[PDB]
Symmetry: C3
């Protein structure tokens, strides 16, 4: 599916936007929503990366880094964009 | 699947989604509609799930463009349909 | 069900929920509890899933009506049950 892998990228840009101002919880919820949308597509190589990004938020952004978790979210978004093209 | 037991929580979620959509909050309303969709996948039903998915895509398209009125209208229509499905 | 690193995620989400409920934000606490439920249904624990659903419904019903202390108590009991399950 190509029309449901562009909503994931649209949420992954809000996630980074929140992560750049300390909104770790809202970014967590956005990534959870993206995982929920990715569970509905036929892709089983981008859902795992989204789960990795969510766990990255949990174990890397709540401790005050906020620079590396954003990087993991950017890597996930770039992987999804590479996949849709 | 739901007789104003698990189908009335969706209405209380949609109301807060509409309230969020009013002032400026597209993202919180989107998250609320996603929660309502997650609730609707458990309480059986097929029409409510589709209408809530339509409302979610409506949030995504209309709300972030700047047309909050259209997104509020679509979520209101979905809430009214869900309310008329529990009667 | 999914033991550590799957249930501690739920515990941390419940801690965030309790933090939010003490300030007055019922909608964000609702969303994070829904996220914690979504983390369940994957670990394999069913009692934990049922208690998370109980906590979600409790947060809605009793905290949207201004009784935040009792909703915080219910979420604390849910978190204590999940912690007692990982040990
Ligand atoms: Zn989460
Ligand atoms: Zn969404
Ligand atoms: Zn909820």
């Amino acid at each position: 599916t190509m029309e449901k892998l562009k909503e994931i990228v649209k949420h992954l840009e809000v996630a980074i936007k929140y992560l750049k101002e300390g909104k770790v919880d809202l970014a967590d919820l956005v990534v959870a929503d993206a995982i929920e949308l990715a569970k509905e597509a036929g892709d089983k190589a981008s859902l795992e990366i989204l789960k990795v990004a969510h766990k990255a938020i949990d174990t890397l952004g709540r401790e005050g880094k906020l620079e590396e978790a954003a990087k993991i979210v950017k890597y996930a978004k770039e992987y999804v964009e590479a996949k849709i093209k």
